[PDB]
């Protein structure tokens, strides 16, 4: 039934349907794949932050971090970069305390920016899809209405078959356009507010680490 | 004419119209009320900000404010709270400048927050009215069309001229809904823009006063 | 009539109706549940705020909190965690005053975040329902009208009178969706405003207690 109407429609309507189907598939895949990464990042951040406040010497933590340096991710890399820069600056030329503090701060900022860039991917695509999804369906419906009006212009009296294709193609276009827009709308804000709360934890950790480093030198 | 159509309408449509009219009246009343208060607050803040920097000793200003011995509004309240906290905190507890500065700043922040809260009432109602209003009109339109189509099938004669009035009722409902909806949607942003600027001015004044208090410690 | 509607409706039409009815019931239940919890939390917060400023020594408050034992919510939990962490850190005599103050602050921050997370449950479901509901109804209406038009062509004895009952039943889908979506936005906004109101009181109490604890150090 639906396949009959889809085949009977022109090529432009079929292209629009294919584009909408592709957008739906991509949106579903991205929504599926983002949540696991976000949850894993949150769990790793909490787990690492648990061990930092246990009273263990920072030197032992730095030594342990070297063993898995190439696979560091999350909140652990910021501490690694900051401590490496601090120790390198302190061991060389006996720099002023402000210099080493600023070096640690810049290293932490760069690492945090890189991590946040890694976390946030393909999120704006969902918003764009949700925003611009129905207007393509409106384009298809307008073309179907035009075809129906052209069919109605025959000299003979109109019949059901003459106006059948336009109505069917317009209805199918509207239905697919409406169907393609739900998941992006339902997921965009929930995905954005997820990162908006990890940013605050990273900022708080950076402030605490800098404050702790201030007293040492 | 139109009055006859309103008289011949069903109960739910009339209730929807009454609800929309009430929402419009409430929104207009709030919009008319808030602007004068905002303008008065702006000019009152500017006047006292100008009075501060004339060069008169702060003790004289505090004495005048205490002599007023009444509730104040705007930048006057922040100065009174800060000076009153400072007077007791300087002699008592720790004499370190940092403690006194932080103690004064906390009181200034509390006063700013309470004033901002007192200045921002009844605003989200406009936003919720603007968000909710069109759906009620669409509900009325759908109900009217449904009843019009249901009534048609009960008679042997099928003429669209018999169905004509229901469309008019639905269009009236939709027009009333949009008319109620638009102005609040505009006024929400138009009013938030002013509160942002007032907050910025208060923050700048707080920074300046904190620096002035700190430099004499 | 509900049984008649279900019998006359085909697949992908009754499922949507069941989903919408379930969403309406769930939204009403969630609202009714959450209002009382928020009210009780506000009352308890006010009561403990009244208790704290009675001039009783902190130690006696600590034995009172211990007498309460496990059942603690909000400010009581924050105070208990802060004092426990402070005493545990101070008994070790292995940290500087700034270190113990920071350690005390961290526990209070964690407890506040946990309490807010406990209070803020089930809110996003209302937003999802309000955002999604109308489009499912539109999809159902379009599908029903498509089926009604398709079934018409089979019988060559079609009349404009016999299609009205078929057309009328299709539009019931969108009315249910709008009716479900109407209260969700208002409930969402009010609950979010109340949570935002509570957050400020929690933050102010945390800062004041941190300052007071630092004073004794």
């Amino acid at each position: 039934n639906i396949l009959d109407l889809f085949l009977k429609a022109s090529l432009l309507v079929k292209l629009i349907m294919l584009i909408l189907i592709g957008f739906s598939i991509a949106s579903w895949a991205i929504i599926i794949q983002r949540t696991r990464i976000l949850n894993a990042a949150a769990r790793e951040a909490e787990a690492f932050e648990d061990k930092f406040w246990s009273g263990i010497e920072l030197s032992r933590l730095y030594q342990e971090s070297q063993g898995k340096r190439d696979n560091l991710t999350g909140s652990e890399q910021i501490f690694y970069s900051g401590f490496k820069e601090f120790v390198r600056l302190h061991r060389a030329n006996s720099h002023a305390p402000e210099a080493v503090v600023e070096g640690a701060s810049r290293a932490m900022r760069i690492s945090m920016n890189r991590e946040l860039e890694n976390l946030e991917t393909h999120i704006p695509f969902l918003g764009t899809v949700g925003s611009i999804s129905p207007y393509i369906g409106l384009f298809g419906t307008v073309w179907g209405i035009m075809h129906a009006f052209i069919a109605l212009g025959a000299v003979k009296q109109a019949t059901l078959q003459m106006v059948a294709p336009g109505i069917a193609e317009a209805l199918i276009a509207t239905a697919i356009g409406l169907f393609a827009a739900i998941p992006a709308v339902m997921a965009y804000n929930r995905l954005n507010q997820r990162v908006n709360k990890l940013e605050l934890n990273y900022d708080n950790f950076m402030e605490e680490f800098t404050a702790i480093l201030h007293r040492q030198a | 004419n139109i009055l006859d159509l309103f008289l011949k309408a069903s109960l739910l449509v009339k209730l929807i119209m009454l609800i929309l009219i009430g929402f419009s009246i409430a929104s207009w009343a709030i919009i008319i009320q808030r602007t004068r208060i905002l303008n008065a607050a702006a000019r009152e803040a500017e006047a006292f900000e100008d009075k501060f920097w004339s060069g008169i000793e702060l003790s004289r200003l505090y004495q005048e404010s205490q002599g007023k011995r009444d509730n104040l509004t705007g930048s006057e309240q922040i100065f009174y709270s800060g000076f009153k906290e400072f007077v007791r905190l300087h002699r008592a507890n720790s004499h370190a400048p940092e403690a006194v500065v932080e103690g004064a700043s906390r009181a200034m922040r509390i006063s700013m927050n309470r004033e901002l809260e007192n200045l921002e009432t009844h605003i989200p109602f406009l936003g919720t009215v603007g968000s909710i209003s069109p759906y009620i009109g669409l509900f009325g339109t759908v109900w009217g069309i449904m009843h019009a189509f249901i009534a048609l099938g009960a008679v042997k004669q099928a003429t669209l001229q018999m169905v004509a009035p229901g469309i008019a009722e639905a269009l009236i409902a939709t027009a009333i809904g949009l008319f109620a909806a638009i102005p609040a949607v505009m006024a929400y942003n138009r009013l938030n823009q002013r509160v942002n600027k007032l907050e910025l001015n208060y923050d700048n004044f707080m920074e300046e006063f904190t620096a002035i208090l700190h430099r004499q410690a | 009539n509900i049984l008649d509607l279900f019998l006359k409706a085909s697949l992908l039409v009754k499922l949507i109706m069941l989903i919408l009815i379930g969403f309406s019931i769930a939204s009403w239940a969630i609202i009714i549940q959450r209002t009382r919890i928020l009210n009780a939390a506000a009352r308890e917060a006010e009561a403990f705020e009244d208790k704290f400023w009675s001039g009783i020594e902190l130690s006696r408050l600590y034995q009172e909190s211990q007498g309460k034992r496990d059942n603690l919510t909000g400010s009581e939990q924050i105070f208990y965690s802060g004092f426990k962490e402070f005493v545990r850190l101070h008994r070790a005599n292995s940290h500087a005053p700034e270190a113990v103050v920071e350690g005390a602050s961290r526990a209070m921050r964690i407890s506040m975040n946990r309490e807010l997370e406990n209070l803020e449950t089930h809110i996003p479901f209302l937003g999802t329902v309000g955002s999604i509901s109308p489009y499912i109804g539109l999809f159902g209406t379009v599908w029903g009208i498509m089926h009604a038009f398709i079934a018409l062509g089979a019988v060559k004895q079609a009349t404009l009178q016999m299609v009205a009952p078929g057309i009328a039943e299709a539009l019931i889908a969108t009315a249910i969706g709008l009716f479900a979506a109407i209260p969700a936005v208002m409930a969402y906004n009010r609950l979010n405003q109340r949570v935002n109101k509570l957050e400020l009181n929690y933050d102010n109490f945390m800062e004041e207690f941190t300052a007071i604890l630092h004073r004794q150090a």
Binding site: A158 | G127, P134, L138 | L138, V163
Partner: peptide, 24 residues
């Protein structure tokens, strides 16, 4: 708070299609 117009357009288009289909 922004005005959502898509549902109204969809309802109007549905009504127009219903009226058009009844021409013959």
């Amino acid at each position: 708070s922004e005005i959502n117009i898509v549902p109204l357009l969809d309802v109007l288009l549905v009504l127009l299609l219903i009226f058009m289909a009844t021409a013959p």
